């Protein structure tokens, strides 16, 4: 249905941007909105016919166009910190006859004054305790991703090279480190709960993965640290049993038994060659 | 349209309402927006009546000038934001602001505890964990400024048909202990604080044991070497009894 | 990309080691140390190296419609024929050693005299 591009976007004060909306179900008229905490959805522009465009309710700073009957792009003339919001796109057939809209997935923007505030996250994994295993026979892992700005991450869990969706819970909204300041960083967490006899295998592989969106390959960087770009950050752990007898140690036992029985087999073949040769010499001396 | 959360027990009937005084509209609809997503159309009507879609049912009062919605057999798969909408025969569908809705589950057998999770050896934090509650419990934030507390959430593990409540706390500073952590909140009496005297069952660890093909082959080669030692040793006895017996 | 389009796909349930070639084509060809070792159509997009316990090495390429790629060198060392030296290992070794040389020596003494 209705698609749009990009998903997330970072841009500095005084830097224009163009973001798309495409449509293939042969409808004719579209719109743009912005959604805010405490204000709701508010209209920006619309276009009932191919070539004729109208204004809305907060259009101050947004230019539009209409070339074909499927594309309807949006342009920003410059940047302001009042532009930070979430933008949606709508679609209907013709002019108040059948009142069904269809929205897109959205687009996030933050606007900073300076690019020396952008940081990537830091991920760490915390293994489960034994009081929970001996009490309830279940095991929970905790993944923390801390210290990032802007807030453009996505989190996932991958047990043995495949994703999981069952038994997982992530926070809905990222928290702030100090909620007193203006340019403050963020933090976010997630859980995976698993039965006890699945954690106790030493053959299982668990990892947490965070996808970050930041700068790109077009921007000046006068700062000492590495230029924060789009990357994946991750953290692993093997499952492990603390007491008892696993198949980590059975290999140890079998290896030492093979080497000792080979050594003994060599010594015994030496002795057999010896007394066989001695009975050959006495056999020569019988005649 | 009324803001603010409304917390509903599981398996009940939900009542919402919007006012539009005063105009004359026809087309009435509802949208459902999950967290970090876009809206989605549920129910579409422009007459007075009842158009069911299963467990969804709305009612429209033309002269009383308000609409409503009713959900029966409510699940935890319904927690969202609900936007009511109306318009003329012209363009510009006019929207309300929506109403955050939360549904809390059935929590059959509680067992509250606060655990200490094993450290990372790559970051210098420590985490505590306060698990299943009975859903009446409230969790309040920290009084301090270096102890970060999350809110509570529900997870669903379908391999054992079980569900639960959780909350996580972490900190950098020293003198941080999992008995002082959730002090700012009210607590159920008789929680469970573990002792450092560890306990590791052994007959539970043996139900998770595997086998490669290489372990099979290496064990069989051991069983070969034992038979070779018995035959060669029997030969050595017979020859040395030949030389010692004469 | 810079003509780098061979990647390793790891950590499966079985110890399988797989390669995936990034080309928007069909009938992908594989090589090793310069000569051909494979040929593979669609519905199978992943060459197979076997288990990681045999710890493979070498250099691998893939080409589709255009020219060949730049190589990748694999190097696994996942030791698995390793014994640690404990008290138990050295004690068992010395005990079996002494008692074997003792029994053989008693036998030779009774043979000679």
């Amino acid at each position: 249905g209705v698609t749009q591009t990009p998903k997330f976007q970072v841009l500095k004060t005084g830097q224009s941007m163009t973001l798309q909306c495409a449509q293939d179900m042969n409808h004719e008229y579209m719109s743009w909105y912005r959604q805010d905490p405490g204000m709701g959805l508010r209209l920006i522009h619309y276009s009932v016919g191919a070539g004729i465009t109208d204004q809305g309710e907060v259009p101050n700073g947004y230019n539009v166009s209409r070339s074909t009957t499927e594309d309807f792009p949006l342009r920003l003339l410059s940047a302001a910190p009042s532009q930070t919001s979430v933008y949606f796109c709508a679609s209907r057939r013709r002019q108040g006859a059948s009142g069904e809209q269809y929205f897109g997935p959205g687009t996030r923007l933050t606007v900073t004054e300076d690019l020396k505030n952008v940081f990537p996250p830091e991920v760490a994994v915390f293994e489960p305790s034994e009081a929970e295993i001996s009490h309830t026979q279940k095991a929970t892992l905790v993944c923390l991703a801390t210290g990032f700005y802007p807030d453009h991450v996505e989190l996932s869990w991958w047990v043995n090279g495949k994703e999981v969706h069952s038994g997982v819970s992530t926070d809905p909204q990222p928290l702030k480190e100090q909620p007193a300041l203006n340019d403050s960083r963020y933090c976010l967490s997630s859980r995976l709960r698993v039965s006890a006899t699945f954690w106790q295998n030493p053959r299982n592989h668990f990892r947490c993965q965070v996808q970050f969106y930041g700068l790109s390959e077009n921007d000046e960087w006068t700062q000492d640290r590495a230029k924060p770009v789009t990357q994946i950050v991750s953290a692993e752990a093997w499952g492990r049993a603390d007491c008892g007898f696993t198949s980590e140690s059975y290999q140890q036992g079998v290896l030492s038994a093979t080497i000792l029985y080979e050594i003994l087999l060599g010594k015994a073949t030496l002795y057999a060659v010896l007394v066989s040769a001695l009975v050959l010499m006495a056999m020569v001396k019988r005649k | 349209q009324d803001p603010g959360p409304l917390s509903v027990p599981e398996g009940a009937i939900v009542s919402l309402n919007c006012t539009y005084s005063n105009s004359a509209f026809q087309y009435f609809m509802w949208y459902r927006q999950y967290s970090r997503k876009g809206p989605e159309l549920l129910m579409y009507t422009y007459s007075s009546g009842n158009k069911e879609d299963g467990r969804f049912t709305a009612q429209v009062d033309k002269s009383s000038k308000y609409i409503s919605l009713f959900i029966r057999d409510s699940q935890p798969s319904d927690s969202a934001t609900y936007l009511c909408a109306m318009s003329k025969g012209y363009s510009t569908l006019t929207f309300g602001k929506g109403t955050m809705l939360l549904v809390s589950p059935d929590i059959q057998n509680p067992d509250p505890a606060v655990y200490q999770l094993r450290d990372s050896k790559s970051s210098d934090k420590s985490v505590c964990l306060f698990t299943d509650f009975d859903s009446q419990t409230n969790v309040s934030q920290s009084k301090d400024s270096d102890v970060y507390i999350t809110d509570k959430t529900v997870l669903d593990m379908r391999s054992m048909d079980f569900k639960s409540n959780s909350a996580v706390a972490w900190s950098n500073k020293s003198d941080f202990a999992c008995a002082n952590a959730f002090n700012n909140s009210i607590i159920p009496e008789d929680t469970f604080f573990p002792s450092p005297e560890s306990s590791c069952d052994v007959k539970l660890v043996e139900k998770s044991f595997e086998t490669d093909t290489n372990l099979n082959f290496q064990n069989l080669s051991v069983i070969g070497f034992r038979i070779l030692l018995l035959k060669v040793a029997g030969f050595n006895l017979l020859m040395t009894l030949r030389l010692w017996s004469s | 990309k810079g003509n780098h389009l061979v990647k390793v796909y790891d950590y499966q349930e079985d110890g399988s080691v797989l390669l995936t070639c990034d080309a928007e084509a069909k009938n992908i060809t594989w090589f090793k140390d310069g000569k051909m070792i494979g040929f593979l159509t669609e519905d199978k997009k992943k060459w197979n190296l076997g288990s990681n316990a045999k710890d493979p090495r070498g250099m691998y390429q893939c080409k589709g419609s255009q020219n060949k790629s730049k190589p990748l060198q694999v190097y696994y060392r996942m030791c698995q024929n390793c014994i640690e030296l404990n008290a138990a290992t050295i004690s068992g070794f010395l005990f079996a050693e002494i008692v074997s040389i003792f029994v053989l020596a008693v036998g030779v003494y009774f043979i000679a005299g």
Partner: peptide
């Protein structure tokens, strides 16, 4: 028991207990 150390220690005792017997079975015979 799963731990095969008990099987191998069972082998050596029954292995060194055969020599002594045979050795003492020929001291009388």
């Amino acid at each position: 028991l799963l731990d095969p150390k008990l099987c191998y220690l069972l082998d050596g005792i029954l292995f060194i207990y055969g020599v002594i017997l045979t050795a003492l079975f020929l001291r009388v015979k």
